[PDB]
Design a protein around this ligand. Structure first.
Ligand SMILES: Nc1nc2c(ncn2[C@H]2C[C@H](O)[C@@H](COP(=O)(O)OP(=O)(O)O)O2)c(=O)[nH]1
Ligand SMILES: [Fe+3]
Ligand SMILES: [Fe+3]
Ligand SMILES: [Fe+3]
Ligand SMILES: [Fe+3]
Lengths: 187, 187
């Protein structure tokens, strides 16, 4: 890892003020969930600070990176918002020197999720959704649910996200539904 | 193929009045969609009459048939409603002697859909959803859409289906989402 203040200082120039504020919220929320569920709070903190590092990077450069250097090529068919998580994990490793594989994995899957996520991945996934600045409808219920049921809170978040994409007639990454089904079948 | 009268004589004994009205509704809607989109109206009629042949068959026998005789085993993880289409396609061939592969596929995929459905599969899938006795919320828009945009009506139906399943926290068959995505991405 690395110093919190330096980390925040490094990410901020890559974010709008609104997104920087979001990042602080995710950080605070990730730490709290890390405490509550026995996750490493420092890895949670760091993954939270850099989760949106690539949010505003050039989309053509990011699609090229996926094609030329990264693993899951199918993401290219399912929406430009799917770029930043995987590309960010790559860029933070290459541009900042974060090599903590746990931290990078949590960044990598924070947008789509994946079946059988690690605790740290789940914490960042959910923190992103329920951080205090978010105003998606029904968030309060998910926040409350998060206090006692991490997986259930994640299921609830996925329902809201997938519902929204359907209403907007946008494509839905198949591994996001696989996450919903996996967690649901886990009960 | 078998004519309407004979086909109906074979399904009627296991149809309540509501189910009989469903059959006729699907049958007439399918014919109209066939007329509209240049599909075979006799195959549309026949597939419609038999689409729900296995609806009220023994669910344990059906699960066993999926296990012993059929290809897709994963269907058994996503709800009892997914049994009757593939098993019905099987039973109609074996018991009724219908070997028309176009008719049988239309029966097989009418509940879940698949990416890259034939026109006849699309007509039966959609006819089931928009037949006049169906009262699901938003149906009227879907019926209007169907008069001009078959793929769009099917997208709208999937949106309402998947949305409902998400809201009730039910497992969603992945190939149903693949269907949505395929039709969406093609337009
Ligand atoms: N196509 C598709 N889009 C998705 C999926 N999951 C999330 N999204 C989209 C919906 C939102 O517009 C966007 C939000 O991105 P995020 O990484 O979760 O949050 P943020 O980066 O906006 O803070 O991601 C998904 O599974 N498929
Ligand atoms: Fe993000
Ligand atoms: Fe975020
Ligand atoms: Fe059916
Ligand atoms: Fe039916």
């Amino acid at each position: 890892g690395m110093n919190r203040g330096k980390a925040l200082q490094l990410v901020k120039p890559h974010l709008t003020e609104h997104r920087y504020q979001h990042t602080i919220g995710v950080m605070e929320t990730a730490i709290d969930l890390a405490k509550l569920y026995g996750a490493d709070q420092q890895k949670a903190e760091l993954a939270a600070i850099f989760h949106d590092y690539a949010k505003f990077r050039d989309k053509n450069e990011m699609r090229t990176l996926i094609r030329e250097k990264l693993s899951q090529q199918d993401i290219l068919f399912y929406g430009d918002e799917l770029l930043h998580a995987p590309c960010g994990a790559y860029y933070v490793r290459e541009e900042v020197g974060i090599e903590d594989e746990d931290v990078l994995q949590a960044i990598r899957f924070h947008t789509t999720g994946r079946p059988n996520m690690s605790l740290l991945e789940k914490i960042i996934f959910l923190a992103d959704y329920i951080e205090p600045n978010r105003q998606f409808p029904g968030v309060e219920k998910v926040r409350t649910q998060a206090k006692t049921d991490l997986n259930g809170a994640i299921i609830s978040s996925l329902v809201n996200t997938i519902t929204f994409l359907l209403k907007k007639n946008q494509p839905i990454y198949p591994d996001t539904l696989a996450t919903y089904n996996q967690l649901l079948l886990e009960q």
